[PDB]
Amino acid sequence: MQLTPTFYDNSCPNVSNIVRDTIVNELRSDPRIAASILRLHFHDCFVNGCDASILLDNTTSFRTEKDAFGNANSARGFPVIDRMKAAVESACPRTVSCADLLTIAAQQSVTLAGGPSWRVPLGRRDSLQAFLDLANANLPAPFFTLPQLKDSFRNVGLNRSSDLVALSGGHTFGKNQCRFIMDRLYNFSNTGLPDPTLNTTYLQTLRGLCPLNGNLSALVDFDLRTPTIFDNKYYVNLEEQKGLIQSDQELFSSPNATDTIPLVRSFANSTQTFFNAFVEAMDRMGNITPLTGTQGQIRLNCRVVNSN
Numbered sequence: 428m429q430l431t432p433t434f435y436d437n438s439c440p441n442v443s444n445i446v447r448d449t450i451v452n453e454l455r456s457d458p459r460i461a462a463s464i465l466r467l468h469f470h471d472c473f474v475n476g477c478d479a480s481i482l483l484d485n486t487t488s489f490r491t492e493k494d495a496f497g498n499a500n501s502a503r504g505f506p507v508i509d510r511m512k513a514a515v516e517s518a519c520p521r522t523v524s525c526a527d528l529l530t531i532a533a534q535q536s537v538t539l540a541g542g543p544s545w546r547v548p549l550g551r552r553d554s555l556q557a558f559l560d561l562a563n564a565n566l567p568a569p570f571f572t573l574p575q576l577k578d579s580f581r582n583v584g585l586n587r588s589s590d591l592v593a594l595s596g597g598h599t600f601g602k603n604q605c606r607f608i609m610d611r612l613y614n615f616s617n618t619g620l621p622d623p624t625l626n627t628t629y630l631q632t633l634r635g636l637c638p639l640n641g642n643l644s645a646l647v648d649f650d651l652r653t654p655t656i657f658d659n660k661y662y663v664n665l666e667e668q669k670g671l672i673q674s675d676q677e678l679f680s681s682p683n684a685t686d687t688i689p690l691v692r693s694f695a696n697s698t699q700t701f702f703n704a705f706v707e708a709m710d711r712m713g714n715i716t717p718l719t720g721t722q723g724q725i726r727l728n729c730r731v732v733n734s735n
């Protein structure tokens with residue numbers, strides 16, 4: 428069946444508010460949680476669809492996706508998702524799937540951070556297993572070239588250039604570890620020189636935050652203009668060659684960016700245009716091979732498959 432935003436309007440009408448309240452409370456002690464949650468949803472959807480497979484803990488039958496390159500010592504916010512699920516289960520027992528919960532949490536996170544507000548289609552169910560090997564092959568890496576980023580998205584059904592450019596806008600907030608930009612800073616492409624597409628003045632600031640022999644786990648803001656606000660500033664940075672990671676700047680500086688540049692220019696000069704495109708791309712991503720109707724289950728605890 429098709430996903431619909433009205434799925435819980437009768438069975439659990441306040442699920443949206445329960446999710447929002449949880450994030451609002453968490454934001455007070457962790458201003459980064461909204462960014463972390465949106466990212467969890469993205470990593471869920473790109474591996475076998477938005478089926479909450481990423482939330483499963485390791486078992487003797489399958490390995491957790493939390494160990495995947497890109498998730499290990501990177502993804503976070505799991506206990507917050509647990510709190511959300513516990514609250515929803517008390518109000519609406521065995522009604523809301525973890526897959527749908529993570530979807531609503533991602534939308535609310537964007538809205539709470541100043542982004543657009545919309546009702547996400549719902550009705551997804553939870554997977555019976557995790558897919559580590561698939562996660563290690565499906566998640567795009569920061570060193571991918573533009574054509575490789577395009578292939579990665581097309582691989583899961585997001586075959587429009589707007590999907591890539593709009594969803595990349597999720598880097599309008601959140602943090603990135605020094606380790607993922609060390610090459611751009613000191614030795615790009617085995618050349619011994621920094622990435623020529625990185626603004627030289629910005630390069631100095633970044634080198635100060637990520638010293639050659641420093642802490643590779645140190646965090647840097649993805650968006651130097653409004654680090655915690657969900658807006659179109661991410662695109663303005665690209666125009667000034669101030670995109671933080673390689674995959675960011677390529678949207679504007681790659682020799683294959685013929686079709687992405689116009690979107691970047693458009694999004695950088697119109698919040699409304701970017702927000703509309705982001706909502707459309709988000710709903711498309713949220714529709715990647717979902718389990719519906721009778722497939723999968725409604726997990727009682729997002730970390731484990733139901734017993735019986």
Ligand code: HEM
Pocket residue numbers: 459461462463464465466469500501502503567568569570576594595596597598600601602603604605607672674
């Ligand atoms: C186009 C390919 C993409 C690549 C190569 C990529 C790469 C990365 C990397 C390297 C990090 C830093 C991880 C760390 O330092 O631990 C990150 C964080 C993040 N990404 Fe992406 N990303 C991509 C797409 C997306 C998309 C589509 C979204 C969501 C719509 C997204 C949302 C985020 C957020 C919000 C964070 C920060 C999370 C936090 O602060 O906890 N990313 N991404």
Ligand SMILES: O=C(NO)c1ccccc1
Pocket residue numbers: 496497498501566567568569607
């Ligand atoms: O966030 C990622 N992919 O979306 C990612 C992060 C680091 C290494 C590999 C991939």
Ligand SMILES: [Ca+2]
Pocket residue numbers: 470471472473474475476477478479480481
């Ligand atoms: Ca998944």
Ligand SMILES: [Ca+2]
Pocket residue numbers: 599600650652653654655656657658659660661
């Ligand atoms: Ca921002």
